[PDB]
C-alpha cells in the first residue's frame, strides 16, 4: 500500500518477547500535538489503529524542536532496540567514517520521513505498538502500530540503508570531500569548506534529497538577539580534552597533602607512573590538619614530576567497536560539568568538560539533559555509537523533567547513581 519493494524479515533476540513498557503521563500540549501528528499518519496509512489484543507497548511523547518550531513525535523504542540487536548491529550495520571527527564543521539533518516509505515486516509490526493518553483519563488510551519502518528504531536505518546509499551516490561523487554518516534518524554531514560555503552545500544537499522524496525539517534562522542558529553546526576540532591537574602552591598544609595524595592515588589506576611514597612521608604522625608542612626538595620532585605525566595519552587505550560505551557526568558546580567515556574500568577514551550555556539559566536538570545530548552527539560522531549513562541524579527527578529539555531524535540508555564526591579527580 506504500512501496512495492520486498519486506525484510526481522525477528527479536532468541527467547525474548516484545516491549511491554507503560506510557508515562504527558502534558496537554504534547498530547494535543501527538494526537494531531498521529491522525495524519493514520490517514496516509503509515499507522494503523489497534486494541487490547496487542500485549505489547512502548512510550511516546513529543518534543517541540526549537530547531524548527514544529513538533516531532518520539517513540522510546529503547526496549525494542535491545530486543532486536542482532539484526542491525552484527547482521547489517552501517560502517563508520573515521573522518567525520576530522572536519571543521558538521551539520546534522533529520532524515526520519525518509523511513515512512518502506513497508515494515508485516509480522514484526505487533511490537511497534504505542498508546496515546488523555488528560484526566477522560478516555481509554488510543493505540496504534507501524506498517512502515518506524522512526527511532535501530532497524529502520539498517533496512533503508540500501536505498539511502543509492540516494547519496551522486552527491558523494560531486563532493568527495564531504563526509556523510547515518545514525538512526540522523544524517551527519561534515565539511572543511568555509562556514558560509558549508551552509550552502548543506542547503544543496537538502535539495538533492528533496528531489528524491526525502524531506528534511525547515530550520529557522531568527534575525533577533540570540542567533542560536549559528550553533547548528558542530566543530569536532574545536572539541577539547580536559586532563587531570594537580594544584600549585607554596604553603601546603597537612590537609592539602592528604588530598593531593588521595587524588594521586586515584589517578594511579589510570597512570601507573604515579608514586606517592615520597610525598606521603611528610605526613607521618598524628599531625593537625591546619599545619603548613614544608615540602621537601626530593619530595616536591614528584609533585612536579607526576604532573608531567598527567598531560599524556592514557596507556594504549583503544576503542573496541564490539564493547558498549559508558559515560559518567559529575556536577562540578557553578554550572560546569565534566565527563568520561570508556569501555573498560579506568582505560577511558575521552575526558571532557561541558562548559555552561546561558540558555540553561541555572537549572540543574536542564543542563544535565543538554550535557547528555551533547556527549551523545560527540560519541556518534567520533565512534558511531551511543554510550550508556551513569547519571548523577535521582530516578524520580530525571524522569519528571528530562523530556521538557530533550531535543534529539534518539534516546540514550541511562542509569542513576548516587556517588558522592569520590575525589576531585577532575580539577576544574
Amino acid at each position: 500500500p506504500i512501496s512495492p519493494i520486498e519486506t525484510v524479515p526481522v525477528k527479536l533476540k532468541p527467547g525474548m518477547d516484545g516491549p511491554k513498557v507503560k506510557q508515562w503521563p504527558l502534558t496537554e500540549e504534547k498530547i494535543k500535538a501527538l494526537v494531531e501528528i498521529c491522525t495524519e499518519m493514520e490517514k496516509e496509512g503509515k499507522i494503523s489503529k489497534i486494541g487490547p489484543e496487542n500485549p505489547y507497548n512502548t512510550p511516546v511523547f513529543a518534543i517541540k524542536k526549537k530547531d524548527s518550531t514544529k513538533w516531532r513525535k518520539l517513540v522510546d523504542f529503547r526496549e525494542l532496540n535491545k530486543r532486536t540487536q542482532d539484526f542491525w548491529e552484527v547482521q547489517l550495520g552501517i560502517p563508520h567514517p573515521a573522518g567525520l571527527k576530522k572536519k571543521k564543521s558538521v551539520t546534522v539533518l533529520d532524515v526520519g520521513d525518509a523511513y515512512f516509505s518502506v513497508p515494515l515486516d508485516e509480522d514484526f509490526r505487533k511490537y511497534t505498538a504505542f498508546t496515546i493518553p488523555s488528560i484526566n483519563n477522560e478516555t481509554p488510551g488510543i493505540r496504534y502500530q507501524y506498517n512502515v519502518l518506524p522512526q527511532g528504531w535501530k532497524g529502520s536505518p539498517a533496512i533503508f540503508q540500501s536505498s539511502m546509499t543509492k540516494i547519496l551516490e551522486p552527491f558523494k561523487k560531486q563532493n568527495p570531500d564531504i563526509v556523510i554518516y547515518q545514525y538512526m534518524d540522523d544524517l551527519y554531514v561534515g565539511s572543511d569548506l568555509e562556514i558560509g560555503q558549508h551552509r550552502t552545500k548543506i542547503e544543496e544537499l537538502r535539495q538533492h534529497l528533496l528531489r528524491w522524496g526525502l524531506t528534511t525539517p525547515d530550520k529557522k534562522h531568527q534575525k533577533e538577539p540570540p542567533f542560536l542558529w549559528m550553533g547548528y553546526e558542530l566543530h569536532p576540532d574545536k572539541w577539547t580534552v580536559q586532563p587531570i591537574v594537580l594544584p600549585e602552591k607554596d604553603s601546603w598544609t597537612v590537609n592539602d597533602i592528604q588530598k593531593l595524595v588521595g587524588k594521586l592515588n586515584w589517578a594511579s589506576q589510570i597512570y601507573p607512573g604515579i608514586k606517592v611514597r615520597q610525598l606521603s612521608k611528610l605526613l607521618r604522625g598524628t599531625k593537625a590538619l591546619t599545619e603548613v608542612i614544608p615540602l621537601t626538595e626530593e619530595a616536591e620532585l614528584e609533585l612536579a614530576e607526576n604532573r608531567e605525566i598527567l598531560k599524556e595519552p592514557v596507556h594504549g587505550v583503544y576503542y573496541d567497536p564490539s564493547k558498549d560505551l559508558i559515560a559518567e557526568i559529575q556536577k562540578q558546580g557553578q554550572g560546569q560539568w565534566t565527563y568520561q567515556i570508556y569501555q573498560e574500568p579506568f582505560k577511558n577514551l575521552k575526558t571532557g568538560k561541558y562548559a555552561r550555556m546561558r540558555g540553561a539559566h541555572t537549572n540543574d536538570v536542564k543542563q544535565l539533559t543538554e550535557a547528555v545530548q551533547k556527549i551523545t552527539t560527540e560519541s556518534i560522531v567520533i565512534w558511531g555509537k551511543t554510550p550508556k549513562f551513569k547519571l548523577p541524579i535521582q530516578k524520580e527527578t530525571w524522569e519528571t523533567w528530562w523530556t521538557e529539555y530533550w531535543q534529539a531524535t534518539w534516546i540514550p540508555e541511562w542509569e542513576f547513581v548516587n556517588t558522592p564526591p569520590l575525589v576531585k579527580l577532575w580539577y576544574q
Partner: antibody
Framework: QITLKESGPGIVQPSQPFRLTCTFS??????????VTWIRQPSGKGLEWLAT???????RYNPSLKSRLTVSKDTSNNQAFLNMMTVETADTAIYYC???????????????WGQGTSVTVSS | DIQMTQTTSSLSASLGDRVTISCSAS??????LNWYQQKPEGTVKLLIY???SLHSGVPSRFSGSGSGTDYSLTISNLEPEDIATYYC?????????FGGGTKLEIKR
C-alpha cells in the same frame, strides 16, 4: 574589498515613487549571514533605519513606513533595491545602504556603508 | 519600540583628551549595541559592535562598555580625525534604532 554604491533619482516629485539601487561587490546576498540594510538621514538630523533585506528573504521593515516601503534584491547581479511610494517633502534625505551581517551568536552590525544618494522631494 | 538616546548632544574637547559618550537604552538590550562614526563629510564607519568589540581596522584608542540599559563609548586620546559625530545602534529587536548622535568638537 566590500564596496557599496547607492543609485537614485536625486530629485523626486511629491506623491510619486522612487527606486534606490545598492550596487555591491565583495560579498553575495546569498551567503548565510549577509543582508543589506537601508538607512536614511534627513539633512541635519541623525540616522534613521528603514529596512533590512536578508539572504533568506525574511525582510524587516520600519513600522512607521512599512506601508510605503518595499525592499527587493537581484542576487544575480548583486543589487539591492528600495522602493518608497507616495513620497512627501519629509522624505528629502540622504539614503545610505550598508552591508549588514550576522557574524556569530551575538555579533550583528552594519560592517560597511555606502556614501549615500541624496533624494530631495519638491515640485 | 526601543528608544535609544544619547543625552550629550554637542561635546567640545581638545587633542589628547579622554572622552566618553553615553548611550542610554529604553529597556534592557542585553549588550546588543553597536557604535558608528560619521565624519564631518558624511561617510559612516563601524567602530564597535556588541558593546565592546573593535571592528578590524579601528584604532585601539577606541573602547566600549555598558550593560543592561546604560552603554558608553570611550576615545582614550583624541586625534584630529576622531573629532566627529558618534552614533549608537541597538539590534536586540526590530525595528533597529539609533541614538541621537553626539557631535565631538574642538575646544578653542
Amino acid at each position: 574589498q566590500i564596496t557599496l554604491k547607492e543609485s537614485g533619482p536625486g530629485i523626486v516629485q511629491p506623491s510619486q515613487p522612487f527606486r534606490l539601487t545598492c550596487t555591491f561587490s565583495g560579498f553575495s546576498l546569498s551567503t548565510s549571514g549577509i543582508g543589506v540594510t537601508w538607512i536614511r538621514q534627513p539633512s541635519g538630523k541623525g540616522l534613521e533605519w528603514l529596512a533590512t533585506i536578508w539572504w533568506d528573504d525574511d525582510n524587516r521593515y520600519n513600522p512607521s513606513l512599512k506601508s510605503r516601503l518595499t525592499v527587493s534584491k537581484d542576487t544575480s547581479n548583486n543589487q539591492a533595491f528600495l522602493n518608497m511610494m507616495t513620497v512627501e517633502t519629509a522624505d528629502t534625505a540622504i539614503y545610505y545602504c550598508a552591508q549588514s551581517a550576522i557574524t556569530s551568536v551575538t555579533d550583528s552590525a552594519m560592517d560597511h556603508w555606502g556614501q549615500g544618494t541624496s533624494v530631495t522631494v519638491s515640485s | 519600540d526601543i528608544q535609544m538616546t544619547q543625552t550629550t548632544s554637542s561635546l567640545s574637547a581638545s587633542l589628547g583628551d579622554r572622552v566618553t559618550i553615553s548611550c542610554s537604552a529604553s529597556q534592557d538590550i542585553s549588550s546588543y549595541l553597536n557604535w558608528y562614526q560619521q565624519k564631518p563629510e558624511g561617510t559612516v564607519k563601524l567602530l564597535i559592535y556588541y558593546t565592546s568589540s573593535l571592528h578590524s581596522g579601528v584604532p585601539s584608542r577606541f573602547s566600549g562598555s555598558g550593560s543592561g540599559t546604560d552603554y558608553s563609548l570611550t576615545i582614550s586620546n583624541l586625534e584630529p580625525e576622531d573629532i566627529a559625530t558618534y552614533y549608537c545602534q541597538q539590534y536586540s529587536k526590530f525595528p533597529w534604532t539609533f541614538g541621537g548622535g553626539t557631535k565631538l568638537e574642538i575646544k578653542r
